[PDB]
Design an enzyme around this catalytic site. Structure first.
Site, mmCIF file in Angstrom:
data_model
loop_
_atom_site.group_PDB
_atom_site.id
_atom_site.type_symbol
_atom_site.label_atom_id
_atom_site.label_comp_id
_atom_site.label_asym_id
_atom_site.label_seq_id
_atom_site.Cartn_x
_atom_site.Cartn_y
_atom_site.Cartn_z
ATOM 1 N N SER A 34 3.999 1.956 8.379
ATOM 2 C CA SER A 34 3.555 0.988 7.342
ATOM 3 C C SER A 34 4.777 0.385 6.651
ATOM 4 O O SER A 34 5.657 1.145 6.211
ATOM 5 C CB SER A 34 2.657 1.644 6.313
ATOM 6 N N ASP A 69 -0.825 -7.438 2.027
ATOM 7 C CA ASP A 69 -0.228 -6.090 1.896
ATOM 8 C C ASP A 69 1.293 -6.198 2.057
ATOM 9 O O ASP A 69 1.841 -5.629 3.040
ATOM 10 C CB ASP A 69 -0.877 -5.159 2.918
ATOM 11 N N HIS A 123 0.850 -1.211 0.000
ATOM 12 C CA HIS A 123 0.000 0.000 0.000
ATOM 13 C C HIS A 123 0.877 1.250 0.000
ATOM 14 O O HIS A 123 0.317 2.318 -0.182
ATOM 15 C CB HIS A 123 -1.012 -0.020 1.151
HETATM 16 C C1 JGQ Z 1 -10.636 2.505 5.476
HETATM 17 C C2 JGQ Z 1 -10.198 1.690 6.696
HETATM 18 O O1 JGQ Z 1 -8.964 2.209 7.231
HETATM 19 C C3 JGQ Z 1 -8.590 1.645 8.513
HETATM 20 C C4 JGQ Z 1 -7.154 1.001 8.492
HETATM 21 C C5 JGQ Z 1 -6.036 2.058 8.225
HETATM 22 N N1 JGQ Z 1 -6.097 3.199 9.168
HETATM 23 C C6 JGQ Z 1 -4.917 4.167 8.903
HETATM 24 C C7 JGQ Z 1 -3.538 3.501 9.209
HETATM 25 C C8 JGQ Z 1 -2.772 2.847 8.208
HETATM 26 O O2 JGQ Z 1 -3.268 2.872 6.908
HETATM 27 C C9 JGQ Z 1 -2.739 2.060 5.817
HETATM 28 C C10 JGQ Z 1 -1.529 2.231 8.482
HETATM 29 C C11 JGQ Z 1 -0.975 2.183 9.763
HETATM 30 C C12 JGQ Z 1 0.346 1.462 10.074
HETATM 31 C C13 JGQ Z 1 -1.747 2.864 10.752
HETATM 32 N N2 JGQ Z 1 -1.459 3.049 12.057
HETATM 33 C C14 JGQ Z 1 -2.450 3.706 12.662
HETATM 34 C C15 JGQ Z 1 -3.448 4.037 11.810
HETATM 35 C C16 JGQ Z 1 -2.987 3.470 10.471
HETATM 36 C C17 JGQ Z 1 -7.548 3.786 9.206
HETATM 37 C C18 JGQ Z 1 -7.571 4.934 10.237
HETATM 38 C C19 JGQ Z 1 -7.791 6.281 9.870
HETATM 39 C C20 JGQ Z 1 -7.713 7.308 10.844
HETATM 40 C C21 JGQ Z 1 -7.392 6.978 12.171
HETATM 41 C C22 JGQ Z 1 -7.280 8.007 13.290
HETATM 42 O O3 JGQ Z 1 -7.509 9.196 13.186
HETATM 43 O O4 JGQ Z 1 -6.888 7.556 14.451
HETATM 44 C C23 JGQ Z 1 -7.158 5.639 12.536
HETATM 45 C C24 JGQ Z 1 -7.232 4.609 11.562
HETATM 46 C C25 JGQ Z 1 -8.640 2.747 9.565
#
Ligand code: JGQ
Length: 287
Positions: A222, A99, A49
């Site tokens: 990531s 991924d 990703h």
């Molecule tokens: C569509 C579904 O998305 C899911 C899964 C991906 N995450 C973002 C994400 C990553 O994305 C590849 C990769 C890593 C290593 C991450 N470590 C922590 C978060 C995060 C999303 C998200 C967005 C905002 C927030 C927030 O505001 O807290 C928390 C999670 C929820």
């Protein structure tokens, strides 16, 4: 090669010389940085990703050893099953199954004090690193590295060439089900009828406050290795894929749902046929 071993009490890339820093060349929100692991003289393992799907090779820069210099990327190999759009129909806006990606470098890395390969599962390097007998099977390496338990592990976060080692627990025993079901706290996954659709058998789960208070990943972690440390050797067991709470943006939210703030990692024991094929000429001695 002698994988997963430090090479004096130095800091940062002296302590974690397999770490690779990835930068997105045309950055946006959610698409700025990633990490990776040196796994051979020509290859860095990361998350799929982290790249654009079109012209992958020109979508990132990669550096090792805390160097300013970017390495020439010859090819980017995505796991063939990876498709972020694969479950849009099920209300899963981003799907992180498989991924994982390999960066083939044009030029051979020269190993030194700040550039060294990490051990990969089901290799002769890991047999030797774990001081195991030559009869050791891939299944035996799995029992040694991922027992049905809360497993002590670590990952590394980077900021201006400074590395921070973070201790986490993989929930692989009686907490595994609870860890996985907490995918439902992830914004955008909260309305999926069946949460097992987002968390496939490819994933390991860390985070939460039992048995200890695990630090969480940020988007920029990531692709970084999830590591098991035994007797001064480091074995990669996972690739950081996705988190429930971005604690770099949203430390408010972790404090709201600390019991459920999980991180999800691609289990390298679940992508071994792909690793073994793509790395077959790298002298790693896959079992
Ligand atoms: C569509 C579904 O998305 C899911 C899964 C991906 N995450 C973002 C994400 C990553 O994305 C590849 C990769 C890593 C290593 C991450 N470590 C922590 C978060 C995060 C999303 C998200 C967005 C905002 C927030 C927030 O505001 O807290 C928390 C999670 C929820």
């Amino acid at each position: 090669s002698l994988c997963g071993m430090v090479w004096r009490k130095g800091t940062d890339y002296h302590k974690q010389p397999w770490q690779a820093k990835i930068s997105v060349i045309r950055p946006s929100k959610g698409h700025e940085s990633c990490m990776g692991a040196v796994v051979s003289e020509y290859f860095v393992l990361t998350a799929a990703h982290c790249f654009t799907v079109d012209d992958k090779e020109h979508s990132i820069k990669v550096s090792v050893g805390g160097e300013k210099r970017d390495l020439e990327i010859e090819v980017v190999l995505f796991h063939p099953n990876y498709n972020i759009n694969g479950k849009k129909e099920a209300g899963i806006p981003e799907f992180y199954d498989y991924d994982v990606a390999l960066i083939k470098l044009k030029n051979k890395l020269k190993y030194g004090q700040t550039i060294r390969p990490i051990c990969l599962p089901c290799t002769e390097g890991t047999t030797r690193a774990l001081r195991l007998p030559p009869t050791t099977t891939c299944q035996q390496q799995k029992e040694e590295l991922l027992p049905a338990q809360d497993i002590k592990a670590l990952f590394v976060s980077e900021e201006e060439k400074k590395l921070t080692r973070k201790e986490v627990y993989i929930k692989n025993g009686d907490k595994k089900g609870s860890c996985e079901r907490d995918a439902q706290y992830a914004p955008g996954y909260d309305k999926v009828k069946d949460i097992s659709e987002v968390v496939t058998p490819r994933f390991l789960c860390t985070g939460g406050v039992s048995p200890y208070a695990d630090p969480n990943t940020c988007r920029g972690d990531s692709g970084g290795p999830l590591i098991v440390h035994k007797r001064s050797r480091f074995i990669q067991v996972g690739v950081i894929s996705w988190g429930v709470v971005d604690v770099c943006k949203n430390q408010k939210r972790q404090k709201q749902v600390p019991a459920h703030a999980r991180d999800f990692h691609i289990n390298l024991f679940q992508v071994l046929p792909w690793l073994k094929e793509k790395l077959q000429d790298e002298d790693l001695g896959f079992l």
